Structure 1
């Protein structure tokens, strides 16, 4: 008995083309370029998952550095005197405190400096 593709291929293909939208030109419309575009897209997804884990960390950091400096502290010195008084805060939170909660950041500062000297 013979068994044409009949259906399967159109199936596979559409799957890709439905992943494949928003894509500029041919990419969103022809299979090969679509599936392809998606190979690379794969690479970018994986890496950029861990990557965003980096990037956010960076962001939090610069916000804290700011905070410290807003009084007279370095990031490194603030964070270090916040290791010294053992104030074991996540730094994401520290950003949050720093930019949305003023006088709190103030206190955490005075603390870090105290524990530093």
Structure 2
């Protein structure tokens, strides 16, 4: 009939403890606010999980701009001649490379420039 839940609850708590990396001086061992602190941490990072890809959307968006603009035309334009496209449509790694191989991009820029005018 004995229910010495012991060893047990201690266990879980250390559990959440491990959940507990190092964070703010205090939830650091706050055997409770610890727990909570977690709860939020978590939902949070979830939110982060989907967010991220966007932040990137932008990220590229810019390295991007550095380049498209560099040559002499905005994303309105790029995107357009670009879509005139046909056997080629690619946006992500684009910029990355404007960086990575000057020419590669260059070229790209050209063909596109023309895509347009």
> Could you tell me the TM-score, scaled by structure 1's length?
0.91
* Deviation at residue 16 of structure 1 after TM alignment: 0.5
Query: Counterparts in 2 of 1:17-96, with a 5 A limit?
Result: 17-86=17-86, 88-96=88-96
* Deviation at residue 87 of structure 1 after TM alignment: 5.6
Q: Once superposed, what is the RMSD of the aligned Cα atoms? A: 1.4
* Deviation at residue 14 of structure 1 after TM alignment: 0.4
Distance 2:89 2:27 in 1: 46
> Could you tell me the TM-score, scaled by structure 2's length?
0.91
Distance 1:17 1:89 in 2: 49
- Indicate the SS of the match to 1:7: helix
- Count residues with an aligned counterpart: 117
Q: Deviations over 1:20-65 (max 9, x none)?
A: 0211222110210111101111121111011101101110111111
